[PDB]
Design a protein around this ligand. Structure first.
Ligand code: NGI
Length: 385
């Protein structure tokens, strides 16, 4: 409030800023005030090229140059909102959750509907996946090797419902927390959601061998081997989700040492796109889908029944993996747009939240559906109920 007035007087004192300020529109002037307030009149005066684009009323040109700055790479979401305001002369960027004071209030630091749906998913997750584990633990006939993978996926999903989703809610509200404390929480969410994905792929591996190599399934994927695969998945989940803590983070209003706990403010975007999305979601998945497609296309009295059962299994499996991608993709596509196009306006609150909701629904119901379609599971469910 007091610093706002001082920032404007700082602009007036520097001959490199004052003429550029006068040239700006009422709204664009506030964007400059925000920028100066943040890094100082000397810092902003170092933007000789972008200042000349603003002075020449080349708005979109100024946006391009500002988005290439050290400023943008330091705090890209705040820089993006200031840049959008400089380009359009509107508060489009500040539409969710007008004057320079309110702009600074937002940057320094619907929601109820999001939290409600998120907790509804958390509850459903726990109930459904615990039921699945009870069926296998109670009913002796369900304690086979395949169900080691089913139960493993289910258990991970229970932990997602209890911990990960509540933590993900925190991560999107922006309360003031120590930067590294907020980084740890984000990593914990990344580990548990990573585990879901890997567990479903482990299930896919098990089924693939069971339908394509039925003559060696018992003699190839043992209880021991299965436990090994599951352990490996968890090792990878921790390794990946905790990677940011090893150095790949964004921090190498309310108080010193505390920051607004927001996912994108502490977790790097190149990490999420290049490493997490492409290598730990897309390639693993698409490869598995491709395998199923080839088994299906190759496939297409007792020798006949044995084949029809594998053509059906191939279609069912393809549909499951397709659904998985349809729910995980929206979120990662939004992330890609934000990362590849720094000039572009950020996705709106309702859209970002919608994508998160979708991904979390899939992250908890993958095991249950598979189990519900099995006759032995369904009847056992009723007997518990
Ligand atoms: C297996 C990998 N795990 C994941 O994908 C998990 O991470 C989380 N997540 C993956 N991207 C993201 C992501 N961009 N933002 C968030 N929250 C914060 C939402 C948010 C961001 C920016 C703004 C500013 C808007 C503006 O300037 O006008 C507002 C809200 N969580 C993610 C999900 O919970 C998923 O389950």
């Amino acid at each position: 409030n007091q610093d706002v007035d001082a920032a404007v007087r700082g602009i007036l004192r520097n001959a490199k800023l004052k003429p550029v300020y006068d040239s700006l529109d009422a709204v664009r002037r506030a964007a400059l005030i925000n920028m100066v307030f943040q890094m100082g009149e000397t810092g902003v005066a170092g933007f000789t090229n972008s200042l000349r684009m603003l002075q020449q009323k080349r708005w979109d040109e100024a946006a391009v140059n500002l988005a290439k700055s050290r400023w943008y790479n330091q705090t890209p979401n705040r820089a993006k909102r200031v840049i959008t305001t400089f380009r359009t002369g509107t508060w489009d960027a500040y539409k969710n959750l007008m004057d320079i004071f309110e702009m600074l209030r937002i940057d320094e630091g619907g929601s109820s509907v999001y939290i409600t749906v998120e907790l509804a998913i958390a509850v459903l997750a726990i109930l459904g996946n615990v039921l699945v584990c009870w069926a296998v633990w109670l009913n002796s006939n369900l304690q086979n090797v395949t169900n080691y993978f089913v139960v493993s996926a289910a258990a991970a999903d229970i932990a997602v419902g209890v911990l990960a989703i509540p933590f993900a809610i925190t991560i999107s509200t922006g309360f003031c927390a120590a930067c590294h404390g907020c980084l740890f929480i984000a990593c914990f969410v990344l580990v548990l959601t990573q585990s879901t994905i890997f567990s479903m792929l482990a299930i896919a591996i098990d089924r693939y061998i069971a339908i394509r190599i039925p003559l060696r399934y018992n003699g190839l994927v043992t209880g021991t081997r299965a436990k090994g695969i599951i352990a490996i998945c968890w090792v990878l989940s921790f390794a990946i989700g905790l990677t940011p803590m090893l150095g790949w983070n964004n921090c190498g209003g309310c108080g010193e040492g505390q920051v607004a706990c927001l996912f994108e403010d502490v977790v790097p975007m190149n990490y999420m796109v290049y490493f997490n999305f492409f290598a730990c979601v897309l390639v693993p998945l698409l490869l598995m889908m491709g395998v199923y497609l080839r088994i299906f296309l190759a496939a297409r009295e007792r020798a006949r029944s044995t084949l029809q059962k594998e053509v059906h299994a191939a279609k069912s499996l393809a549909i499951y993996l397709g659904l998985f991608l349809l729910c995980w993709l929206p979120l990662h596509i939004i992330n890609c747009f934000t990362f590849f196009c720094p000039d572009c306006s950020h996705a709106p609150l309702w859209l970002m939240y919608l994508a998160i909701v979708l991904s979390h629904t899939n992250s908890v119901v993958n095991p249950f559906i598979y189990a519900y379609r099995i006759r032995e599971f369904r009847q056992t469910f009723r007997k518990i109920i």
